[model samples]
Target: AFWASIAYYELNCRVGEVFHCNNNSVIVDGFTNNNSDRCCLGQLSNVNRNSTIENTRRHIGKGVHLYYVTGEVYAECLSDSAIFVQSRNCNYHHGFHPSTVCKIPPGCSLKIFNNQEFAQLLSQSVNNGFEAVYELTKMCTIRMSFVKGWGAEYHRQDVTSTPCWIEIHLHGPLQWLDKVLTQMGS
Candidate 1:
């Protein structure tokens, strides 16, 4: 009862799986390219369609490992090839490129989300006003691409342009939403 779902995963057009960040973890692996790939994520009941894991499995050998510690969540690339990530907190780290899209080489990890920074961002919006909240709310989602990079440095300019990628809707931000709603209602 205490462990709430930390995030829900979306693979292409299907909502693949849901994961809770306790002292636990999970792997985001790939299946066959066809809609029949449901076997990989068959345990998931959310998607009526199927997961288009596609050719991602070839490179994502062991798949990306996701885990949590304290108030943050991290994605560790266990694949043979590098994985690309785009997260809200990324920019706050890199002062140079700050491309937002981070390339995690095999055996490397990146902080996908930070609850502390997320809250601070929302609170900063408190002073910036309503329009900023609309902007900040969009950050609650994180994106990752497998075996490829998409950005100004690469020919692929969008997530959809990549063959394999996933989007995660975080749970902590929803709690922030609830509190904001209460603040607004009262």
Candidate 2:
């Protein structure tokens, strides 16, 4: 059950699916049900009912690809339009003050989630800051928007305003878990 999954929304905020990404990599694209396997191989299919999604499908392009290898999360933008990424529990250098968001343009890729850095973050926070850091780790998540971005750079800086986007969740843990398990064994 911890193989990693994602939930998406139609532009109107309708529930898309709590999709399972059982594979190591999945390519999310603009084609509808391409039948290529590994889920959404070529389609977000946020069409018809959502005018915003349909109107902005041009920005959706070939779409973005995500890789989950050795518990590392990376996103490669295959789209013609830019994509904005908002990752919680990680640093954002581009757009701070408001928890900076990175705008990844076409033909670019990035390591959205770093296993070691986040493990250290969780470990350091657990390793403690006199605050409820561990409790907030549950708040860790990733959001990527197609073309349009939801930040102070644009009005209505939030997910609801974005026409197309996806949310990712991970498995058990990385080095952080190993640290705990070893400590428990000791």
Candidate 3:
């Protein structure tokens, strides 16, 4: 009716989207083309060609990694300790070189310390003229000796000087971590 209405109005609108977690990735169930964020949930799934394994990275102390394989707990020590000692009756697999059986000195009582404490003691021993040695036993008692010598060949009687450092083993039932895998369910 006037001069050819050439003016127009514009309007803006917003829409909402949904997302679902699927196989370590987020998927939009309704929308197939646009998937939101790409993130991994650290989940292992089975595929046709190759398999991906999601393993629990647990530290079993003494530089060991506990892993699940073939329906059993598989673990490997990260690094070999200068002197590694373990009970003969340990449930988890363990082995050592130059292993021996002996009695802890009657007076000494070995205290099981945390990693830090143990390391400090070991460093002090090494610096104070002592070398590490393993003295394990099948019985309740175990023993350890650090002497001032080149190797573990010195005869107990032949040596005159007292052990530079000594640690008498303590006998006790399995500790918390020890019984974890041993008593998996119960």
Best by lDDT: 2
lDDT of 1: 0.63
Task: Tell me the tens digit of each residue's lDDT in model 3 across 88-167.
Answer: 32211222232332222222222211223323333433434322211112222222222122223434431122221112
Supply the global lDDT for candidate 3.
0.22
In terms of TM-score, the best-performing candidate is: 2
Residue 36 accuracy (lDDT) in model 3:
27
Q: Candidate 2: lDDT over CA atoms?
A: 0.66
lDDT of 1 by residue, 32-107 (tens): 3322211133244343333444344467666677775675778888777898888766555453353468899999
* Stretch of 10 with least lDDT, candidate 2: 89-98
| Lowest lDDT block of 10, candidate 1 | 33-42
Taking the tens digit of each residue's C-alpha lDDT, what string does model 2 give over 1-186? Answer: 444677776555755567777677787776563243344523444334456667666667678888887867888888888888877544432224435677887999987776766666566565554243444354347777788888777885787788767777766453344455356445
Question: Between prediction 1 and prediction 3, which has the larger TM-score?
Answer: 1
Root-mean-square deviation of candidate 2 = 4.1
Error of 2 at 6 (Å): 1.4
Cand. 2 TM to true fold = 0.77
Clashing pairs in 3: none
- RMSD, one per candidate, in order: 5.5, 4.1, 28.3
* Superposed model 1: Cα runs more than 4 Å off: 1-12, 15-23, 31-54, 93-99
Selected candidate, larger lDDT, 2 vs 3: 2
